[PDB]
């Protein structure tokens, strides 16, 4: 028969759709898993979707994924109450079976599921407490702690009067009665979590709003014979904006940094006023640009902007990245616009920070001295940079830092004798030629 | 203006001993509105 054929692979594919969805269920995938689950006929695979939740819960590989699982059940219970209605039934019987079996591993797997379902308003507080009364009727104390650690936050909110009575009997345990040792320190840890107010049992996937979950708080008790509907999981046979062309927000901010920068006496005062503002990290690249542009209105180098920038860098590392990004943004882009009166301010500015290790020597590796990748105003900037390196460090200490820099980009050492002839020609034109003793040995070997 | 400036105050008991550095700032001139009035030390290029 082809109708029995067509319904069976329909029953097969629905079983073969739900099982990889549950196995792929995790946080930040719940909404995408619930979407694809919704298009598969949940109501026909009513016990199929229930049994695939139960076995994926029970398997003991999970237990971690239970709050991901119970959040899907609340989504289902919000959409169709009958799915969470039947799935709460089986978990009651799965507890009562394994509690009678004394399978302590399988009980706690169900009890963590019943806890978080109560956290997600799937089930009533009545179904939780009567489990607690049965467990506390025996010892069963390893099971009941893992319940009350997770659900006691919500349960004391809802049913405080009876829940206080659960504590008071539970306090009579480790107070007037002798207990086994390893179980005992776990019970008093629950008393320790009580004073810490349950802040480590109250985190999960509250995706549904309290009015988006249709409130089917199922008031089933664990003394009810619960119909045990395994039969529907078998196969059967259905005969059935304004664009912003202006930057006036930036201009009012660019005015505020400039007024800070001119109202201060010393560089430590201007540094304190800029750090007082708590400038957001997207603007901290731009604040360095306001400082450097205001340093070029001064028409002479000042140590004010140096000790301003030094207190920026030692404050936090995001300022130090902002100066490192700006030094690349100055050399590769901004050199073409600057006049030669402004380049001697910058080369003395960046030479001051490099010579006192506020910027590393590895930032100098960006600068390359060729005929092609070198602008005539760029060579002026290198000249006023190295002079501040010579005046501060000396000609010998600068020789040591340039040797540890391995920035051949600057001084080559191999490759295109026309660049080695270029670089010796340029450095002697500055007046520092004592560094160029390495290149002259390399040059004559090529000859 | 020359006095809408945070004045460096740093530990007068130990400031006679060594150079402490600028560790704290005392307020220079107060008033409801926020001054920010520039001072001409920022407008006079120094001797060095």
């Amino acid at each position: 028969d082809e109708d029995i054929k067509f319904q069976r692979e329909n029953w097969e594919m629905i079983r073969s759709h739900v099982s990889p969805i549950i196995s792929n269920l995790t946080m930040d995938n719940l909404q995408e898993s619930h979407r694809d689950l919704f298009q598969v006929n949940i109501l026909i695979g009513r016990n199929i979707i229930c049994k695939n939740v139960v076995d994926f819960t029970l398997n003991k590989q999970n237990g971690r994924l239970i709050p991901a699982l119970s959040a899907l059940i609340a989504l289902l219970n919000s959409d169709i109450p009958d799915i969470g209605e039947t799935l709460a039934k089986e978990l009651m019987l799965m507890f009562v079976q394994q509690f009678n079996r004394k399978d302590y591993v399988s009980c706690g797997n169900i009890l963590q599921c019943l806890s978080i379902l109560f956290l997600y308003d799937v089930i009533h507080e009545i179904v939780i407490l009567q489990i607690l009364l049965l467990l506390l009727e025996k010892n069963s104390l390893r099971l009941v702690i893992a319940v009350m650690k997770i659900c006691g936050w919500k349960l004391a909110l809802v049913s405080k009067k009876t829940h206080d009575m659960i504590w008071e009997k539970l306090r009579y345990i480790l107070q007037t009665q002798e207990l086994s040792s390893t179980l005992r320190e776990s019970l008093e840890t629950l008393f320790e979590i009580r004073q810490k107010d349950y802040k480590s049992g109250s985190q999960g996937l509250f995706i549904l709003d309290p009015t988006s979950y249709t409130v089917h708080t199922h008031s089933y008790i664990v003394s009810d014979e619960d119909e045990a509907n395994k039969e529907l999981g078998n196969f059967e046979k259905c005969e059935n904006q304004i664009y912003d062309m202006t930057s006036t927000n930036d201009v009012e901010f660019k005015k505020k940094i400039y007024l800070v920068l001119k109202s201060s006496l010393s560089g430590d005062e201007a540094a304190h006023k800029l750090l007082k503002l708590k400038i957001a990290n997207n603007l901290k690249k731009s604040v360095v640009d306001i400082i450097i542009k205001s340093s070029l209105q001064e028409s002479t180098f000042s140590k004010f902007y140096s000790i301003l920038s030094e207190r920026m860098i030692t404050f936090h590392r995001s300022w130090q990245t902002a100066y490192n990004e700006t030094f690349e943004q100055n050399y590769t882009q901004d050199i073409e616009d600057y006049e030669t009166d402004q380049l001697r301010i910058l080369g003395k500015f960046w030479g001051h920070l490099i010579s006192y290790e506020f910027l590393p020597m590895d930032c100098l590796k960006i600068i390359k001295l060729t005929e092609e990748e070198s602008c005539p105003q760029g060579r002026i900037f290198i000249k006023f940079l190295f002079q501040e390196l010579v005046n501060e460090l000396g000609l010998d200490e600068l020789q040591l830092r340039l040797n540890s820099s391995k920035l051949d980009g600057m001084f080559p050492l191999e490759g295109d004798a026309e660049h080695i002839r270029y670089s010796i020609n340029f450095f002697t034109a500055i007046g520092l030629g004592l560094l160029t003793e390495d290149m002259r040995s390399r040059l004559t070997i090529i000859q | 203006s020359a006095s809408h400036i945070l004045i460096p105050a740093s530990d007068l008991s130990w400031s006679k001993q060594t150079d402490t550095g600028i560790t704290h700032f005392r307020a220079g001139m107060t008033h409801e509105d926020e001054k920010l009035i520039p001072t001409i030390f920022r407008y006079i290029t120094t001797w060095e």
């Binding site: 540094a271 007082k276 | 105050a9 530990d11 560790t23 704290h24 700032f25 005392r26 307020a27």
Partner: peptide, 27 residues
């Protein structure tokens, strides 16, 4: 707190005496 810094008083000082820690001086 008056940890050795600030003024004896803000009476004859013609300031408010408001002291705030230098965020620049840390290391």
């Amino acid at each position: 707190s008056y940890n050795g810094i600030g003024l004896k008083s803000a009476k004859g000082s013609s300031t408010s005496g408001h002291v705030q820690r230098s965020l620049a001086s840390n290391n």
